[model samples]
Target: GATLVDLFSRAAMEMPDRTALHIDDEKISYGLLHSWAEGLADLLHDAGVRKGDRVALRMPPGANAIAAMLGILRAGAAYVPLDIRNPPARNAFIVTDSQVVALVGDPIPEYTGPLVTEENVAALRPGPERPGPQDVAYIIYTSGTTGRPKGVPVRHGNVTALFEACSRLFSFSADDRWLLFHSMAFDFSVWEIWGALSTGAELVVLPYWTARTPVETARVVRDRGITVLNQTPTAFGALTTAVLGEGIDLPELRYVVFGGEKLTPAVVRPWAKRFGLDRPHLINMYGITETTVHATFHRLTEDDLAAEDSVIGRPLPGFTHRIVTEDGRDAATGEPGELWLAGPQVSEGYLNRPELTAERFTTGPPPRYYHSGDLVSRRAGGDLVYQGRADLQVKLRGHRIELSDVEAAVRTHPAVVDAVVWVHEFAPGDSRLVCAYTAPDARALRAHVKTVLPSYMQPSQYLALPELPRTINGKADRASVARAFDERR
Candidate 1:
């Protein structure tokens, strides 16, 4: 009864004729989606996938992927989605690492892949669904700095709580249209999918091509009548540029939620001004895969953006956050410390990594709490302000560099999009500062940086990329960018 299948079943019986998904010109109702998921569930059931099985789905973000995900959950199996856009080697690593017993996709790749196809899986004879709230629903793998991915096993209870939290926080309803821009593999898509299905909202699945450009973003927001727009700060920056350049208005947009990276005031101000600060609610959510999707929400106001740094806000309802020092004691007010979260939404733990799980997910004082690697400080205004990561992870240096002391300095030229500082390591003991940018006018960007930052902090080289590479979850893939820099060397 706790399965996502039950949620779909309820929607089918209650609002069968209501539009459930919109992908470009294709429109699917709740009845169709539920029936398709049932068929896929049958297909998965016949493929020897019984309760507690694991299925790997390597496909694009569309109806097929959505059905496959729900089918796996309905069949009482955990779904592990691998980004098809990633290198085959990375996909292969995820499949092997997760021990996926079956794979579902359009066509089998030439290489000796994991499992054959959904048809091959369907040959195993159908079985009854036996899933419960405690059963594992999915395993989302996060890339480690070491190149290997760590699998986070999210249970049904975790997902249920997550959807409930999201539904209450965002006030999602059947009339709401949530734009599904994240890849199926990323955890944010979990929010996009469940937030719609659990709350009877319509989900618009945007293809990868449509998500790449500002023009496409504007078109989709306008054409689809999207009410909820979720994206990263970088993508929001581009959207802001698109709005200013094209003068496109999205009257239907009621909420704009950004996460997966640092939320800067520079990125939040433009949209607030254009959309009118009070019109569309701007929410800044913070979370990781281990916490389902989001654990905190910071609703932004025009006055908040006028501050020196935008606050990340506090924990969402049903969740509690505490800032603690390295000694495991509460951090003093206004001092940066690691963020620890506790709630029904917190995931069980990483799969097959007991030691690492024990290290990160532990019991805190008073109630059980999960340690979030994020560092933050309680500001004088009683709101929590996010500092950089407590670890060596820096979002600068052309990549998600794991170096210390690297800082990002933005250049405020009218034409510059944004600028960040990174350390380029040529060899041992030989490193220099480098800046990467995307700007309407590159010449003006260079001139602007020259006036602001000190000479040493100034970039030795400036590379203009059409757009930064992003991971399946819409977060900027700094590792991929770093690899590109390595190839240039």
Candidate 2:
């Protein structure tokens, strides 16, 4: 039942003088990092941050942002991370929704919450308060079906389970330099932050600007000797393109971890071939924010390069999965169904969302399950092959088609920048599937798909775009696509 602070302190004591973080030419040691957080924790406590209070963090990801978040946790309070790029009004809604007791980092004009500015953080002094295992760790707001985002409060116990399960995979050492690549608002940062801090590994912070310019990220990785790269396919695709185009070699990078979107062979094969199939072990992970970052992982191989999916491997040490059919019964082996996962890594449920929580997170006994809307098939070999989402499946002209399947094929086209297909009624009583793509030649792609798929599955209309819109989490923003199409109409 070790808290995040305790684990971080242990690592700091284990290697006090070892380099803990590399950011903007600052080579900070474990001891100094711990002391900085300790001082900040004192300031937070003096500002009236009690145990179990939610403190909203509004700062760009950097050394200070990391320290402030750790300090908030050290003071026995959970953090609600706010993305700096988000509109002020949207962030204000988050402040009100999470009911954050105090604001940290930058000042939000719309927020009437208690203030703790970065300038004054150095002056205040107080004491440390240890939080219990059941206490909340952080509240991350995730995308909802509605316009607003939903707050998901994950506990310390759940996050620990995630760490323990992932610990079994690799032999982490102090020499390992990990990359903090994603936004703090994304749950993947949870793994990035604690994983490096608790294991005595040096974290190399990739600056927000550096990440925006994908090509420059290659230089960062090469210069820093980043050993671990945990990224979404969207980000990795750009990195791979840059590395290959520039002929850069990442000799120290041993792990290229991918998640957020479905890991397709089209994305993994080329990157693995360039990076060396086994030189940097390519791991495909499937997870959600509600599931504490990641639940299942697959060590992708050349054999899996041609696979429809990257082949999500067996459940982790403390996890199990269930495939339920359309009839609400357990699906037989090799049958497609909705995948439900049960594990200690699962969250306690959403904050102030009992009805929605009850619908997804069920209660009963040991090995509780959370209903994942994703569709997949469980193999006899105990592997899981991901299919499209259950809800994304629709019937077109009496033929059932999965939009993900179509989108996956579209992405394979050489000229395609990105692709998304949506069904809409262009004319009264004539519902047709229309495709929007960022491709050099829409007609050529249409012809290519015409041969690959059935007539009924082919897109009736194909519109070319310069680039596809993406959500904050880096997935294709279909809602925006629909809106854009409506505007065009």
Candidate 3:
């Protein structure tokens, strides 16, 4: 029943001097991290941030960013972390939409809120403002079909319950060292941050400079003796290339958990072939931001690696799942259907989209479930096999992208009449978004998108067409566009 604060505080009190966060050359002790959090909490309180408030954390990933997160929690406010790499306008929109009481980092261009950067923050009388399990812990934004990013407010109880449910599956300890491999804005980081802190494990923050460079990231993992490594399957594939090229040895790595994207056995077969899956145990976890990071876990085996299907073993403890067909009846074994999950780990709903929330989440006083639109089927052995999305949503390099979201951003440009976005695998194991639009030119469209969308969401290749190919229903035909683009090339 304890909150995230309780979990971290317990670990802090028990191991005061242990190195909690290692960022580059800096090593932060648990005692020091705790003190820093309190200092930030004091600063936040001075800025008039109160209980149940939302605070925007806009700092770049590093020690201060993490401290600000804990400080927000310590001061009884939920943090809405804004990615510094995203367009300033995007972050500004989130700040306004979330209605944050104060911003705890560098000010975004359009926001005129109470600011608390590193220039501020001083030690004051220490008093913790406790938030119960029911209180919101953080708000993570995800791509929505409505062409706007939607906020998912995860509760403290939902987060802590996730770890509790996984207790039997993992032997996490203080001796282990976990790598922070994802952006704070992503829900994957929520797992990386808490999974390490709550367990009293050393959290090694991978510097941003090496974030895109898998070779450098692999070197750090080898040098730091990181025991727990979490990555998207695509990212791990890059890291595997780096490791094999440099002959990097990670003897201490105990777990290599995959999330965010589909984990095909083919993607990880090379890594397992090189080092074997035993030392750094390869595991695949199926998750969603609305479902508190991870909902199911499947440990990879030799049989799994050779198998053609993507196997996501089962739900964590305390989670009950159902695979229902389009007719609302339970799907039979080996039949594809939508996955529905229910448990403490489920978030309340979208921040302000009540209509959409009600449409997605079941209305019930008990056993409320989130209707995940993902398609999956159960194997005879009880493993759930992923069957891709039932909607236009797709995961590319771990970032969830809505084709409609990109099309919306594209339509905003005056030059564009209409657009169709889809991921095209140019080659085996290589996939990138291709945008075919009714535009004057691709040059202006490319520049227009850069100012509105993050690099990941931006289509790598743009096909400028006088008129978009349409189907008999008068809708943009994605397949026709793909074929036209291919035939043109």
Candidate 4:
């Protein structure tokens, strides 16, 4: 029942002098960040920001961004992060739709927009403190299938659950320096922020432009002595290549956690060996924004990689998962079914979409769980391996095409780095098998894929992209891939 403000106050009192945030060469101790946050909170209070008012953050990740976020929460207003990397139109849409009372950013841009930037808003004098657990903390908008973004309302309690769960899972300490690789708009970044702040760990923010390259990322990690890394499978793949090519070493790293999508064994195996199996703990986590970041955690061991499929591991503490059939029946031990999560971590429901929320976030039978739309099955030792979406939504075919079987077959190829199978529906009846692949060579990968998969499952066209596009949360952007395929055709 603690608010974000309460957490900041506690950290300031308990570990005020500890380094709490880092942006490039600058470092802010817990006391300093807290003071700055308090100053901004006062500024917000003076600017007419009331309890439950939405404040949009349109900026890259850094100390300033963190200060603004904490300030908004302290001011009893939800902090909605508007990713600067996102198209101006998208940013405009979120700001307008959220009806944000104010926006926070450094180097304010002159635009005829709805929200006022920090330059204009911060001039106000500090006001009285006000916030509570039941109040809204932030609204995160996820990419929607219908094109209109879906907003996920996160309450103060939701933020508390996230940080508390992260603290419990990681056993974080003040000495821990978590590398912030994810964008601020994504839920994962929200976790990264709270994970550091609540546990009194140092959060080192990576700039959006600088983080685009692997060399820059490696330099930051090594130079900053980053102790923990939380990135997507794609970003990790690039980092792996950088480490191998540049021979850069992360002597300070103690943990590497990957999520937002399936963690392919092909990707993690090499990094595990390089980092030493014992030194840096490699974890594969599974969770959706609806669950406040993560619901499952699997620490990878050398032996676990021998499995035929990529297992997402087990549910997190205080959380439980069930695989159920379409008829609302529990799946048999080895059979694949829809994944249902039951825990306190699940969000209240989607904001403003009561019908959609009711449809997806249903109250199941006796156990009462939220269906995850993802299809998965239990492995031999009680671990869960993701199959595919139950909806038969193929990321390649452009239309609804079953891809679980295809992905399983494609992984059989030794040369494939990562193979994503999806449908490409060009027209009502003119759909083709299209795939976006990541491998060293296109010709070799194509030949290898054909040898393993059946003719029907084999992609009619394969585009060898250096890397796959990712959503704000670091998950593969299947819709973006589909859009790229359409553009190519």
Highest TM-score model number: 2
* Candidate 4 backbone overlaps, count: 14
Q: Pick the candidate with the highest lDDT.
A: 3
TM-score of each: 0.88, 0.94, 0.81, 0.90
lDDT of 2 by residue, 1-489 (tens): 367877888999889998877886988788988888888888888778899999999877677788888889989999999988777777888888898889898764565667777665534324677887788999998887545789999888888888889887965777788998888998998888777888899898877772356678888898989988899988888788888888898899888888888777877766767766877888888888888888888888877876565588777787877898988789988889988888888888888888989989875656678988988888778888887677679887788988877876677687786788878776688888888988557678888898777787788888787777776677777877877886886
**Candidate 2: lDDT of 119?**
64
Model 3 lDDT-worst window of ten: 469-478
Error of 1 at 330 (Å): 0.8
Give per-residue CA lDDT, model 1, range 18-119, as digits (tens).
888888888888888877777777776766888898988877777777877877888889998888777777777777778877888743334343453545
Per-structure clash totals for the candidates: 3, 0, 0, 14
Candidate 3 stretches with Cα past 4 Å from truth are: 122-128, 210-212, 364-366, 392-489
lDDT of 4 at 344: 64
> Residue 42 in model 1: shift from native, Å?
2.1
Please provide the root mean square deviation of candidate 4 (C-alpha atoms, Å). Answer: 3.3
Q: Root-mean-square deviation of each candidate, in angstroms? A: 4.0, 2.2, 10.3, 3.3
Q: Which residue runs does candidate 4 get wrong by more than 4 Å?
A: 106-129, 166-168, 210-212, 364-368, 391-401, 404-419, 438-447
Which candidate would rank higher by lDDT, 1 or 3? Answer: 3
lDDT minimum window of 10 residues, candidate 4: 106-115
Candidate 1 clashing pairs, residues 3+ apart or interchain:
46-124, 47-121, 397-422
| Predicted structure 2: clash tally | 0
